[PDB]
Design a protein. Structure first.
Length: 244
DNA sequence: CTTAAACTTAA
DNA sequence: TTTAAGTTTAAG
């Protein structure tokens, strides 16, 4: 199992086997909520359409893909012991927030993700990264995961857009997997239900859609028109399967 | 996770 | 003619 080079909340890494077990085959996989892209890195589709609302994330992904060797060499220089203190961290965080250069921001983004607290990605309403120092002993530099990502990204397109726009890209040969922000144990409840509506529209166009979420009475109401599978609170896999 | 600041509401 | 109580936001 291949790991993502980013630390991300709800990476769905221990759930990969279950997801892949209920994920239909197709020419193209569409991910409206790509995140770290664990499913992307552990599946074998001919091409991928990967989207997310986070512009820094999508920007980073395209840079790692197109300027791989340049990026790895630049980002590696920040994974040294000298940068592992709070004072240096908050200066790099400041440099990130003031920079208008996509490459430099992408380089610092990896640093902030590995040196920041719990790999959190948090912004204020100004759009400024404000995750505090993580105080780690020895942050790992994901050089292998970076190169593996770039290799797989050769057949992937990245888009910075909401789920409704990315799911509209799906066609007859597509499969859609959705990993939205977790429902109550930002992404509103109305958006949670609207996601299910779009999936119902797609499944009538003979486009298979798989949704992962918490197993609650509220999520079961949303995904009531789908085949429900309980994993291991519990994890819910809502599969929308077209009837040929 | 926590506290503090920013901002609104009521009466 | 006011300000404590609430709600949201910022950030260690
Ligand atoms: C990794 S997925 C959810 C993972 C896991 N279920 C959890 O909640 O911890 C979260 C991602 O969805 C993206 N996202 C949030 N709202 C979105 C939206 N409206 N449209 C597309 N992507 C969105 C965020 O950028 C974030 O990276």
């Amino acid at each position: 199992k291949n790991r993502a080079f980013l630390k991300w909340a709800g990476g769905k890494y221990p759930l990969l086997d279950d997801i892949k077990r209920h994920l239909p085959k197709g020419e193209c996989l569409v991910e409206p909520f790509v995140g770290a892209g664990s499913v992307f890195l552990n599946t074998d589709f001919s091409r991928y359409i990967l989207a997310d609302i986070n512009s820094d994330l999508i920007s980073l992904y395209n840079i790692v893909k197109m300027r791989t060797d340049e990026y790895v060499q630049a980002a590696r220089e920040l994974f040294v012991p000298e940068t592992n203190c709070a004072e240096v961290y908050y200066q790099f965080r400041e440099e990130f927030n003031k920079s208008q250069d996509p490459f430099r921001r992408a380089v610092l983004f990896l640093y902030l993700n590995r040196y920041g607290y719990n790999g959190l990605c948090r912004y204020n309403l100004r759009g400024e990264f404000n995750v505090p120092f993580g105080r780690y002993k020895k942050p790992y530099f994901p050089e292998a995961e970076l190169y593996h990502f770039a290799e797989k990204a050769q057949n992937a397109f990245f888009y910075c857009e909401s789920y409704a726009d990315s799911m509209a890209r799906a066609d007859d040969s597509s499969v859609v997997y959705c990993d939205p922000p977790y429902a109550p144990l930002s992404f509103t409840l109305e958006q949670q239900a609207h996601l299910a509506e779009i999936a119902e529209g797609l499944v009538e166009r003979h486009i298979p859609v798989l949704i992962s979420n918490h197993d609650t009475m509220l999520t079961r109401e949303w995904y009531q028109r789908a085949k429900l599978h309980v994993v291991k609170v519990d994890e819910l896999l809502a599969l929308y399967k077209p009837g040929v």
